[PDB]
Amino acid sequence: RPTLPIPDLLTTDARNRIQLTIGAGQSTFGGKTATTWGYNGNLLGPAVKLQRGKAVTVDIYNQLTEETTLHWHGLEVPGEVDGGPQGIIPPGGKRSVTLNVDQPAATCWFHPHQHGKTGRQVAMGLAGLVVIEDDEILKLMLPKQWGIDDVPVIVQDKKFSADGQIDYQLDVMTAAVGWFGDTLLTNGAIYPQHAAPRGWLRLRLLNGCNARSLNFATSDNRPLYVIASDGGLLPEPVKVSELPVLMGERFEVLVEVNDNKPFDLVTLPVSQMGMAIAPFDKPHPVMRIQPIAISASGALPDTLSSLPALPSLEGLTVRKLQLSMDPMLDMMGMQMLMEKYGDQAMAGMDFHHANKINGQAFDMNKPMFAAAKGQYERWVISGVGDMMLHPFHIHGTQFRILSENGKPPAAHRAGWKDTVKVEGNVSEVLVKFNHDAPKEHAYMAHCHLLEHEDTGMMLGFTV
Ligand SMILES: [Ca+2]
Numbered sequence: 457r458p459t460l461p462i463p464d465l466l467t468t469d470a471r472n473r474i475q476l477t478i479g480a481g482q483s484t485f486g487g488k489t490a491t492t493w494g495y496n497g498n499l500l501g502p503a504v505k506l507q508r509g510k511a512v513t514v515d516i517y518n519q520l521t522e523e524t525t526l527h528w529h530g531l532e533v534p535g536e537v538d539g540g541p542q543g544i545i546p547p548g549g550k551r552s553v554t555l556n557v558d559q560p561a562a563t564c565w566f567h568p569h570q571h572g573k574t575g576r577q578v579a580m581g582l583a584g585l586v587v588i589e590d591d592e593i594l595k596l597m598l599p600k601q602w603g604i605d606d607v608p609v610i611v612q613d614k615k616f617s618a619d620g621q622i623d624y625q626l627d628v629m630t631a632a633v634g635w636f637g638d639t640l641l642t643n644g645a646i647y648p649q650h651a652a653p654r655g656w657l658r659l660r661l662l663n664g665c666n667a668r669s670l671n672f673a674t675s676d677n678r679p680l681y682v683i684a685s686d687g688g689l690l691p692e693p694v695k696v697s698e699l700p701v702l703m704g705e706r707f708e709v710l711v712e713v714n715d716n717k718p719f720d721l722v723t724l725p726v727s728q729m730g731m732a733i734a735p736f737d738k739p740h741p742v743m744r745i746q747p748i749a750i751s752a753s754g755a756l757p758d759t760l761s762s763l764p765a766l767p768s769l770e771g772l773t774v775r776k777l778q779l780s781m782d783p784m785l786d787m788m789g790m791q792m793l794m795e796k797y798g799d800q801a802m803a804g805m806d807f808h809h810a811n812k813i814n815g816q817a818f819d820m821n822k823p824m825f826a827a828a829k830g831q832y833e834r835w836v837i838s839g840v841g842d843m844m845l846h847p848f849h850i851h852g853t854q855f856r857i858l859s860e861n862g863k864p865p866a867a868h869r870a871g872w873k874d875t876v877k878v879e880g881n882v883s884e885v886l887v888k889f890n891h892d893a894p895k896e897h898a899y900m901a902h903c904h905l906l907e908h909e910d911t912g913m914m915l916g917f918t919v
Pocket residue numbers: 758
């Protein structure tokens with residue numbers, strides 16, 4: 457197996473700047489070359505390293521031949537630098553943003569947010585990571601050797617055509633159920649191996665799929681100890697044997713590594729339309745962990761951080777967000793899925809403006825409301841009325857889940873999150889926006905099943 461590719465850990469240079477170049481290149485998958493897009497390279501991107509309380513300026517050079525944007529997913533930053541669909545970078549052009557990091561340590565990420573084309577641009581290869589550090593986390597003595605015992609794991613599926621090229625399409629079927637493929641990539645590689653020292657191995661997991669939810673486990677059922685979610689550390693580790701991860705979510709886990717026993721990280725079949733078609737009808741390897749018989753230094757702390765109480769709900773503004781899909785899209789898309797793949801597509805269970813929030817397909821020129829600045833609000837998001845999975849992402853914040861799809865959140869999902877599951881039921885989150893977003897650079901709230909976002913399931917809001 458190839459070694460697990462490790463994204464470069466990109467820190468500020470001598471001028472306090474970071475340079476990112478967006479461009480087209482080539483990669484090889486299964487011995488066949490494909491055109492791919494990357495940040496500072498051919499595919500995917502680096503891990504931008506930030507410190508809480510320190511400003512960095514990022515210079516972003518778009519060397520593609522089409523318009524793009526760069527969204528810092530999970531970052532609590534003003535709308536002007538949030539990189540939603542209004543954050544246009546012309547082809548051949550450059551935009552610079554200053555990030556004033558004002559949140560605790562976390563693994564965030566970055567990716568395009570081009571109006572109507574986010575799915576395609578992510579599918580072509582664009583995604584990178586953000587590693588935010590603070591004083592608190594560094595005192596913990598967690599595994600911290602990047603690319604050795606502290607490793608990012610960006611898991612993505614792709615569909616390829618017979619010629620080896622990426623086969624992306626936004627059509628009636630994918631507008632309904634998402635773009636998904638039969639090939640799983642781990643930091644861009646097919647089933648790579650990672651050599652890790654004996655002791656604890658820290659994995660920063662990102663589901664970077666357009667539409668496919670994942671469920672991580674190990675091949676011998678050794679536990680995963682969840683230490684962090686989208687917005688940073690949990691108060692204490694949460695031991696799990698399976699870890700569902702929705703599109704765009706991150707979790708950091710520690711797993712034990714010992715000398716005479718290699719094992720795989722795997723993903724288990726999920727109950728989501730289209731996602732259990734072979735080879736995903738069975739557990740699927742993600743990467744092989746190869747023990748190297750030298751002792752690692754990292755620890756699993758009993759206590760990771762302090763998690764504040766949920767604030768009082770009394771008197772908070774409640775905003776209702778009803779997700780919906782045009783019944784015609786729902787029917788036609790499901791029918792196309794069934795016709796192509798048959799019953800296995802349901803195991804365990806103009807389209808361009810057919811997905812909606814509050815009866816409205818995304819209109820970039822009309823923010824749906826103004827949210828308060830510096831005040832907790834209660835947002836209620838419903839997927840009642842269809843059977844699709846909607847991981848709902850709200851920009852400009854890290855929130856607390858009060859209820860997730862009609863149930864209290866699982867312990868490892870009860871900390872800081874920027875995504876919440878919505879699937880045929882109702883979720884409620886406690887959100888606060890500390891930064892401005894004017895109408896010209898509004899925050900987005902949207903489904904992170906990218907083809908839903910691209911066909912209308914998004915709203916803009918100002919702060
Ligand atoms: Ca202990």
